[PDB]
Structure formats: structure tokens, C-alpha cells
């Protein structure tokens, strides 16, 4: 049978669960999911139980979601509770540090300030902040209450041991652990700040808005960002300590019933959810309060499948709660863990590693998205991306550091490549203005030159991104294998239409090969045709060609030889870039520039010697067209770097794209 064993942690909870089971039997057909009710002693027991394969699901607070993630439990989030609006789910909240305007300090300057806490042991008001500040705490850090009283000059920490550590109760003597204390709770801690008792108050993103009606008043207040800037209170989503999931159903990583769990809970909310007016409410029980699910919930969203536990909690959270749980502190820039896609990339990376003598290390992952995810959650530090991946890496909170440069260095804005529409000279009927029902070749989908620029522009002409209806057939590696845009792809087995090496029509060169062999139009960079014509490319497919046989398509409507790319382009392309985490801009920016003048475009004969912009077999780690790694100056946002023109386009293209890492990242940041 298709049963979901639900874990209760109390007698009251089991009773509800039983009702849940029973009422489900009225509504669900026997060709549908069941509830079995498993009572355990605690949330930890439940976690073990699921891991043990004695239960299937339980709903956890964020701290516990973390514990469940850890081996030997290896549970993951599968369904999220949402609150209030359907349009706007209240899935996550943000822990913020709120300060007075012009109080004149940053996150890294909190030592000897007056802090306001919502209460000891609360996440937003304690666990998170103190978790992040853990390594700044004076030794010994046990007891933690002591080391915190020795950090801040004085504070209000409700439920703190004021008897032993008076500096914790200095703003609220006795440390009222109830609402008799004025400085207790969400509104409480915020009051502590407003009443000018404390310099900073650790609260939810929403506390500030619930305790100050008029915008005029809210302008007196800023947020401390972790990058040690401040920001208005309205920009809590870019300036927070952590992003915390409210209530999460969790399953086994592999062999869970994610699918079945969702099916059950979905049908469940359908018939018994908010205002379904039945005898059984899913978010209410006469037995108690918050049984199985928060009573305040409005329903469930399915957690996107790409989402592991670490990615769901976020880097900040994991960091803080890890420090709390482990309690391990270490200095300048350690090794930079670089992310390698392939076995051949890994090989080039091992060379780079041992040459810097430890100053570079190599983590490797299967796909690019696998690599981004590793940078995100700090298993890896940096890698080089296409502009279209930079977009994604950005939407996931990674930032660009250094652009790859092709032209002759260090300081150069622009310097980007050209998106070009390459045709065969002979068919003179082809124009940019009328490419409908033509065969087409893309580098991959979601790539700058191959997809983002060309299809971006083309969208402004058809007003949809369903391009496999516009073009007759084509090859656009990374499409749905059943799409007409996988018809031309030359990949064999499960490699057909796959955006990797094992698809011959993948990338700049591959899309051109496609054009040559099968397509009517290829979307590639300007440098592509020259490099793979006139005997330069020694492969049979490319050997005996010459660029005179090929032409570009210009926006106005005309054509021009492969040389007039100067003004026969589609648009200028955001250069390929190096992405990392906000908290590594400094580290990466430094160690790379230093690894550049050692092994860059100022030592030749890259045989026995090491070069950074040389590859054994095609562009490994960095392109081969690369000469130097540029400073970005202002442009270290994925918006600022790509430009709003690129972004507006990719925004439109998103309506159709299939990226699962993007899907997960925009679950947290809609
Ligand atoms: C490449 O750099 C040179 C340096 O002066 C510049 O003249 C040239 O225009 C650049 N690239 C282009 C757009 O041709
Ligand atoms: Fe590119
Ligand atoms: N597994
Ligand atoms: N597993
Ligand atoms: Pt497994």
C-alpha cells in the first residue's frame, strides 16, 4: 500500500493524527495515500524513527530541521507550511539586527554595545545572532551566557541568569522571562532599542513594521548587514542575519515518500485545509494547540526537489547554528576551494593546487548547478561561470568578483564578447527579421550567447518563450528531451540533448558544428567561426571549411561577412566571470590576482610549466581566450554586472526555463 507513517511527539498529537488518518479514508480512494500514526517521545526520537525507517514524516522547527539533516539521520525538507497570503506565502522569516540611524557602527563592531534580545534560547533574538558572533566571544566561551556578558557591555536578555551574569539583565533587571518585562518578546526587544536602552535589537524582519505605523518613524532605523554595511528596514531581504523556514515537513533523503507525502498533505489541505468548514480542521485541534502543524498555517507548499537541507536553511543559518552546536573557532585567506566540473577540469585543478602550494584546493561536482550549490553552502569557494550562470549564481546569493578578459588589462570595464547569428552564405533568403520555421543551433539553453541574448531579443517579437514552436526543429542542449529543439542534437544514449561534452553540439564550437552539419542558424560568439574554420580546427567536420562560406545576421535586417561582427552583432555580451560568496569577495579577489601574475599571460610554453588560461583539451576551468581577470569596481551585483537589459530579458525567459537550482533559489527568494 501507499501509506505515510506520521510521527507524533505527544498523546494529544497522536489523537489528532488518528482523526487525520480516519477522515482521509472518507475522501481518498483506495487508489490513494494513507496515514499511519506513530507516537514517539520527542522530536529527536521522531527524527531517529524516520531515519530508522519506522516512520515517514514529521514537521520541524528550523533548529530541528538542522539536526535531522545531520548524519546519521540525513533527512531533508519536502513540504513547507505557508502563512497568510496565497499570493505571498509566509514560508520564511528573517532574523535581523535593527539599529538607530547614525548610531555609527557595523555588525563587526558590536563589542561593548548594548544589545536587546527577544529572549534567551530564541532563534532570531539569541541563537542566530550569538551563533554568528560566536567566534568574537571572549574565551572561554563556555558557559555561553558568561562569554556574551563579557562581549556586550550590557544587555536585556530575558530568561538569562542575571544572578551570575548581571550585565545580561542590565537593561531589564531580573531578566523578566514573561510580559511583565517590557523588553521581553518581539515587541519587547524592539522597545528596548526604541526607548534608547540598547544600541541594537535582534528581531524578526516584521517586528519593526508591526510596532511603527508611519514610514516617517521607520526611517530612524537601519539594519546591520553581515557585510558590515547598513540598509533601510524595508530591505530586510538583502540585509539580514539569517533566513529561517517556519515549519518544515521532513523525510528520508533517499527512500523517503516525498511524492506520496506531498500527495497526502495536498489532498489533506484540499478537503480539510483553511476554511474548508468540515468537522475536521487540519490546522486546528480541540485537543491542544499547534498539533502536527502550526494552527496559524494557511496550507502547504511542496519544497522544490533540488533543495537539500543546507540549501534550505541557508549559509548564514547553518553557520550560526553550527557554531552554537559544535563550538569550534580558528588569520587571513586560507586555501580557495575551486569547483571542477569534469575529470579533465579536476586534473587541471590538481596542477594549479600544488603549484600555489596549498593556496588553491579542488572540490569537484558533476554538473555546474552542483558546483554553484557547493559554493553556496561553503563546500566550495569559487568557480568561473557563463553570464547566464552568473545570473543564476546571483539569484542564489553568490556574487561576481573577477571577469575573464579576452582583449588586451587588470582594469577594464566592458571588454565583453559579441552574440552573433551565423548562417551559411549560400542560403541568401535568411535574415534576422524572418527566422520562423528554421532549424537553429544553440550553445546550450540559458547561456549568454547561445540562448539568453538571441532568444531574449526574439521574445520581443512573439511575446512568449515557447521557441520550439517558432523554429521548426533544432539543437539547444538542456531542453526537454521530447522537445523539437533536441531533434538535431547528435548525442547518443542518454547524452542526446545533454548540456555537457558528451553531446557533440554542446557549447560555442558544438552549436557551430550543428550549423555546419544540420542547422540553418547558429547563435554563438564572434570568435567562434574564425577559430573553427580554415584548417585551424583539425577535426574532419571543421577542417575543410572557411569563413568566406559563412555570414552573420545584423539587427537592421541585412547580412555581412564573418568579419563585420563589429556592427553585425545581436548585442554585446556580459563577459564570463568568477563567482563566490559575499564573505569571500575579499579573499578570492586577493588570492586570484596573486595566482594570476605567477601563472597567467606572462609565461609561455605551457608544456611542463603551468598556465592558467591554457587547457589540455578545450577550455578547462577558465576559457582559453582569457588573458587576465578584471577588477569589477562597482559591478559586483549580478544586476550591476549583467546590466538591467540582460536581466529584463532573462526575466522574460524564466517563464519557460527548466533550471531546478534556480527553482529552489527562487523558492526562498520569490
Ligand atoms: C580591444 O582593445 C583595443 C585596445 O585599444 C580596442 O581598440 C578595441 O576596440 C577592443 N575591442 C574591440 C571592441 O574591437
Ligand atoms: Fe558565454
Ligand atoms: N539509498
Ligand atoms: N543513501
Ligand atoms: Pt541513498
Residue numbers in the entry: 3 to 332, 337 to 414, 418 to 679
Q: What text appears in the publication on this structure?
A:
Here, we report the molecular structure of the adduct formed upon the reaction of hTF with cisplatin. Crystals belong to the space group C2221, diffract X-ray at 3.17 Å resolution, and present a single hTF polypeptide chain in the asymmetric unit. Inspection of the difference Fourier (2Fo – Fc and Fo – Fc) and anomalous difference electron density maps clearly revealed the presence of a peak in correspondence with the Fe binding site at the C-lobe, close to residues Asp392, Tyr426, Tyr517, and His585 and of a peak close to the side chain of Met256 at the N-lobe. Close to the Fe (anomalous peak at 5.20σ), the synergistic anion malonate, present in the crystallization condition, was added to the model, as was done in the starting model and in other MC-hTF structures. The peak close to Met256 has been attributed to a Pt center. In particular, considering the experimental conditions (pH 6.5 and the absence of chloride ions), the long soaking time (72 h), and the absence of an anomalous difference electron density map peak in correspondence with the Pt ligands, in addition to Met256, two NH3 groups and one H2O molecule have been assigned as Pt ligands. The cisplatin binding site is located on the protein surface at ∼35 Å from the Fe3+ ion in the C-lobe and at ∼30 Å from the Fe binding site in the N-lobe. Refinements indicate an occupancy value of ∼0.6 for the Pt ion and of 1.0 for the Fe ion. The average Pt···Sδ(Met256) distance is 2.2 Å, in line with the expectation. Accordingly, there are no major changes in the orientation of the two lobes and of their domains when cisplatin binds the protein: the C-lobe adopts a closed conformation, whereas the N-lobe adopts an open conformation. (iii) The cisplatin binding site is distinct from those previously found for Ru3+ and Os3+ (His14/His289, His273, His349/His350, Lys489, Lys490/Glu507, and His578/Arg581),33 for Fe3+ (Fe binding site), Ti4+ (Fe binding site of the C-lobe, Tyr188),31,33,43 Yb3+ (Fe binding site of the C-lobe), Cr3+ (Fe binding site of the C-lobe), and Bi3+ (Tyr188)41.
Human serum transferrin (hTF) is abundant in the plasma with an average blood content of 200–370 mg/dL in healthy people. It binds Fe3+ and delivers it to cells through the transferrin receptor (TFR). hTF is a ∼80 kDa single-chain protein consisting of two lobes (called the N- and C-lobes), each comprising almost 330 residues, separated by a short flexible linker (residues 331–339).17 Each lobe can be further divided into two similar domains: N1 (residues 1–92 and 247–330), N2 (residues 93–246), C1 (residues 320–425 and 573–679), and C2 (residues 426–572). Remarkably, upon Fe3+ binding, the domains of each lobe rotate relative to one another, thereby reducing the solvent accessibility of the two equivalent Fe binding sites.
